[PDB]
Design a protein around this ligand. Structure first.
Ligand SMILES: CC(=O)SCCNC(=O)CCNC(=O)[C@H](O)C(C)(C)COP(=O)(O)OP(=O)(O)OC[C@H]1O[C@@H](n2cnc3c(N)ncnc32)[C@H](O)[C@@H]1OP(=O)(O)O
Length: 170
């Protein structure tokens, strides 16, 4: 199982594995953008909407994989505004339910942070469901908690919940 940065040219190889990861993460209960009715048709559409920012270089995408089998993934959105070059937003960090607790989340974030540094990004920020396993995760990775935004998004079943803002100065 290896970590690879995905390009526009290698995307096709991981597209299916990435849609299944999103699929299992959503139905595992996480708030990562979708509802309980997400099916593979919609996961594929999510994957296809990533292709252009990945080809344009503003969205970096990684996966931890066994060939085409994707066990986890992480993305970094490089801010492109003329006064925001010092920052980037971590998003879509996900690990198959069955492969959790084995350190994959952390192997991804360590890559993300090192590439962030190689792209002169002094600031990494993100938001994630308040009270979720993702909170203890970022905290363990020494990300600082800013606080919450109430009713930020709904859980896959409809319930409104807050998101919690975290950051890391690299
Ligand atoms: C911007 C963002 O991406 S927000 C999206 C966040 N993603 C999600 O909520 C998706 C659902 N969750 C997941 O896919 C996973 O649980 C992730 C990505 C949050 C990370 O999970 P894993 O890959 O299994 O984490 P990993 O084992 O690398 O975490 C390392 C440390 O984090 C902490 N940790 C991980 N899982 C947990 C948990 N369930 N409870 C408490 N602490 C935990 C621990 O400190 C752990 O060190 P340890 O194993 O010695 O105790």
């Amino acid at each position: 199982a290896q970590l690879r940065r995905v390009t526009a040219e290698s995307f096709a190889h991981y597209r299916h594995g990435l849609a299944q990861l999103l699929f299992e993460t959503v139905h595992g209960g996480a708030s990562v953008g979708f509802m309980a009715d997400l099916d593979m048709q919609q996961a594929y559409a999510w994957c296809d909407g990533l292709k252009a920012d990945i080809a344009a270089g503003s969205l970096l995408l990684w996966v931890v994989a066994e060939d085409d089998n994707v066990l986890a993934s992480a993305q970094l959105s490089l801010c492109q505004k003329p006064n925001g070059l010092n920052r980037a937003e971590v998003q879509k960090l996900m690990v198959l339910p069955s492969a959790r607790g084995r350190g994959l989340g952390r192997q991804l974030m360590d890559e993300v942070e090192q590439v962030a540094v190689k792209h002169k990004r002094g600031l990494l920020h993100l938001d994630t469901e308040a009270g979720s396993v993702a909170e203890a995760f970022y905290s363990a990775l020494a990300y600082t908690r800013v606080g919450e935004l109430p009713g930020y998004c709904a859980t896959p079943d409809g319930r409104l919940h807050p998101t919690a803002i975290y950051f890391k100065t690299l």
